Amino acid sequence: TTYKLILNLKQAKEEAIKELVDAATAEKYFKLYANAKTVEGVWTYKDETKTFTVTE
């Protein structure tokens, strides 16, 4: 399923979309992205269509 992730920094809005199979793996990829691309703060997941929200 298509996984969506959006990061909201203090001065850098970054958002993208990545397809995966499950959330466990998504969390692996999605988290690795938010942790590498930007910072990893709060984590709000959406059960509407596999969406990940993290800001710091």
Side-chain angles (χ1 to χ4, degrees):
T1 330
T2 304
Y3 258 104
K4 314 185 170 103
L5 174 72
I6 53 132
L7 291 107
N8 316 299
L9 284 175
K10 181 68 207 87
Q11 46 110 355
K13 290 166 77 214
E14 183 63 277
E15 307 94 81
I17 312 296
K18 341 258 65 187
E19 212 197 79
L20 249 307
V21 296
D22 213 288
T25 277
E27 180 161 60
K28 198 226 102 198
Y29 179 106
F30 254 169
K31 192 283 216 134
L32 245 104
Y33 166 102
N35 216 343
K37 266 65 217 70
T38 69
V39 187
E40 49 146 334
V42 291
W43 278 91
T44 346
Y45 181 79
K46 252 94 104 72
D47 227 25
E48 218 247 67
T49 174
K50 277 124 290 291
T51 354
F52 269 89
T53 316
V54 59
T55 162
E56 211 284 85

